[PDB]
Structure 1
Amino acid sequence: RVADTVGTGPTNSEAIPALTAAETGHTSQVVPGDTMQTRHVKNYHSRSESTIENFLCRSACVYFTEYKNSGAKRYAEWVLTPRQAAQLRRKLEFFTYVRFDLELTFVITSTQQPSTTQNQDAQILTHQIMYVPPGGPVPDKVDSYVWQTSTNPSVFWTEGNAPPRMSIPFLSIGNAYSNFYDGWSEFSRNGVYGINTLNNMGTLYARHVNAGSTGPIKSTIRIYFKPKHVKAWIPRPPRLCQYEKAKNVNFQPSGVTTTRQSITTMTNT
């Protein structure tokens, strides 16, 4: 981790650690004792908060969807990506290739909707969240045969309990997920660009298992991703521009930095 400062006295020598050539593409290994007289300091500081498995291993909200126990929008569909929401996305894009296991956690809430229904009296709601791996049947309605879940992972959750959670393995067909792809999936080099199937990891469906009330209730499910067991390769400059789309790297040109008055001024504007 952090290294200890070593004491140094006066010099007058043919050594020149301060002078260097930065054209070589090498970062100089100069320490403070080289350029000045220092005392010996014992350092007890650590670099344990800046591990990759600390930086990326906190739950982050990626998406939220709504669905109702009446009318249209009886269920919610979402294709799992960590690219809908800015904050998690930016952190993963300090790297080109990442490999991790997910832990999904769901915060499901319900809100009574305005109506003129007399004598509402909800029963407790039970919700079903169904993970469907790539390919295979997709529910086209609440009350299809796809919600049987004979071989699709699924959880059921009654209100007023702890959030559900489940672990997902590393599901890539590649040896790492890629956050950037500089190519086309077609051999003609036509169609969509930057689209790849290394990051597929199914679709998520959510519904009510009962309409408890005679009146309308609308639920909101929020999905949290927590990377764990992380490994990362090839670091990249942070994103400077705001994101526009979830499938593209497209951007509006942004200035390098914010301005200031002069090149000698000691304040920001």
Structure 2
Amino acid sequence: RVADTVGTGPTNSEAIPALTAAETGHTSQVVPGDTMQTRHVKNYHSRSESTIENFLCRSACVYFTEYKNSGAKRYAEWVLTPRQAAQLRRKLEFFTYVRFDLELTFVITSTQQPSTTQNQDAQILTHQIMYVPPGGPVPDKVDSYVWQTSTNPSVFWTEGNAPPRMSIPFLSIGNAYSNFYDGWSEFSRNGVYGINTLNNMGTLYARHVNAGSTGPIKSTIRIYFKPKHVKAWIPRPPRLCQYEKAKNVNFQPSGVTTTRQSITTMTNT
């Protein structure tokens, strides 16, 4: 619930709530009443749909990969980072430090692949999405002992049902995820730059449980992240120039604004 205006009237005393240096790094609060006179206006506008959480808590697609059910890449693999989609990434990079839980929803959709195979009939492919914590074992062949899910979480989802959902709590070595890290991992200041171990929730692998149809089928796992219980500290400028890399802040210089005509033009080009 926002603030309200109140009646003022003429002003001829030495108050000048307008004139004040902004050289002191102090952003002054000036109301309508200070530059004119405005009667008592009640405002019922609500500054809710602008809260830190509600802003960030929207499911954004972070990635999607493809994996053949019969051929070579029968599994996909992804190192979890929100740095693969421009949309979600820019929202997170509006804060230096963020803390949150994740809701991972996977929208797996299958598409038949053109082939000359006879009598292709699917018997409802079942997909396995498996979470491998950081420093886990790494599957190779899709039949490896790794897929036994001995302790590693996994969602088993039969196709044609509500998409799988699971939560992850806040998992960070530190007490907040750093969205910007200035420093190296190595004491000699070489190697990787800002590839700190705090935003590295291991890998997520996915594959077809069954052998599907006789023919080839390619499935597309689409990953959705939704930040719940968000707390965000230290605000910072939104990114201007386009992203170039998924782990660096590399950029090509570009405009400071969109151009127009003169300084006194009243219409954008």
TM-score, with length taken from structure 1: 0.99
Deviation for aligned residue 1:35: 1.3
Query: What are the Cα deviations for residues 54-105 of structure 1, in whole angstroms up to 9, with x where unaligned?
Result: 1000100000000011111110000110010000000011100000000000
Match of 1:207, SS state, is strand
Deviates more, 1:95-104 or 1:130-139: 130-139
Deviation for aligned residue 1:194: 1.2
- Root-mean-square deviation (CA, aligned residues, Å) is 0.7
Match of 1:24, SS state, is coil
For structure 2, the 5+ residue unaligned runs are: none
User: Which aligned segments of 4 or more residues in structure 1 are displaced greater than 2 angstroms?
Assistant: none
Match of 1:173, SS state, is coil
Deviation for aligned residue 1:37: 1.1
**Equivalent residue number for residue 166 of structure 2:** 166
**Equivalent residue number for residue 202 of structure 2:** 202
Deviation for aligned residue 1:145: 0.4
Task: Return the alpha-carbon distance in structure 2 between the equivalents of residues 237 and 120 of structure 1.
Answer: 54
Task: Return the alpha-carbon distance in structure 2 between the equivalents of residues 51 and 207 of structure 1.
Answer: 38
Task: Return the alpha-carbon distance in structure 2 between the equivalents of residues 224 and 133 of structure 1.
Answer: 18
Task: Return the alpha-carbon distance in structure 2 between the equivalents of residues 231 and 202 of structure 1.
Answer: 23
Task: Return the alpha-carbon distance in structure 1 between the equivalents of residues 164 and 12 of structure 2.
Answer: 68
Task: Return the alpha-carbon distance in structure 2 between the equivalents of residues 222 and 159 of structure 1.
Answer: 14
Match of 1:136, SS state, is coil
Deviation for aligned residue 1:136: 2.2
Deviation for aligned residue 1:11: 1.1
Percent of aligned pairs with the same residue? Answer: 100
Deviation for aligned residue 1:211: 1.3
Task: Return the alpha-carbon distance in structure 1 between the equivalents of residues 43 and 247 of structure 2.
Answer: 45
**Equivalent residue number for residue 234 of structure 1:** 234
Deviates more, 1:94-103 or 1:32-41: 32-41
Task: Return the alpha-carbon distance in structure 2 between the equivalents of residues 47 and 60 of structure 1.
Answer: 23
Task: Return the alpha-carbon distance in structure 2 between the equivalents of residues 136 and 166 of structure 1.
Answer: 19
Match of 1:206, SS state, is strand
Task: Return the alpha-carbon distance in structure 2 between the equivalents of residues 121 and 188 of structure 1.
Answer: 59
Query: What are the Cα deviations for residues 105-153 of structure 1, in whole angstroms up to 9, with x where unaligned?
Result: 0000111111111111211100111100011211101001001001000
Match of 1:218, SS state, is strand
Task: Return the alpha-carbon distance in structure 2 between the equivalents of residues 133 and 156 of structure 1.
Answer: 18
Query: What are the Cα deviations for residues 13-32 of structure 1, in whole angstroms up to 9, with x where unaligned?
Result: 11111101011000011111
What is the total number of aligned residue pairs between the two structures? 269
Task: Return the alpha-carbon distance in structure 1 between the equivalents of residues 255 and 216 of structure 2.
Answer: 49
Query: What are the Cα deviations for residues 160-185 of structure 1, in whole angstroms up to 9, with x where unaligned?
Result: 00000001000001000000001001
Match of 2:23, SS state, is helix
1:95 aligns with 2:95: yes
Match of 2:238, SS state, is coil
**Equivalent residue number for residue 8 of structure 1:** 8
Task: Return the alpha-carbon distance in structure 2 between the equivalents of residues 137 and 44 of structure 1.
Answer: 56
Task: Return the alpha-carbon distance in structure 2 between the equivalents of residues 2 and 216 of structure 1.
Answer: 59
**Equivalent residue number for residue 17 of structure 1:** 17
Task: Return the alpha-carbon distance in structure 1 between the equivalents of residues 164 and 173 of structure 2.
Answer: 27
Task: Return the alpha-carbon distance in structure 2 between the equivalents of residues 173 and 165 of structure 1.
Answer: 25
Match of 1:78, SS state, is strand
Query: What are the Cα deviations for residues 180-239 of structure 1, in whole angstroms up to 9, with x where unaligned?
Result: 001001100011111100111010000001112110000000000000100011000110
Task: Return the alpha-carbon distance in structure 2 between the equivalents of residues 56 and 153 of structure 1.
Answer: 26
1:212 aligns with 2:209: no
Match of 1:22, SS state, is coil
Match of 2:38, SS state, is coil
Task: Return the alpha-carbon distance in structure 1 between the equivalents of residues 213 and 30 of structure 2.
Answer: 71
Query: What are the Cα deviations for residues 228-266 of structure 1, in whole angstroms up to 9, with x where unaligned?
Result: 100011000110010000000011101110111111111
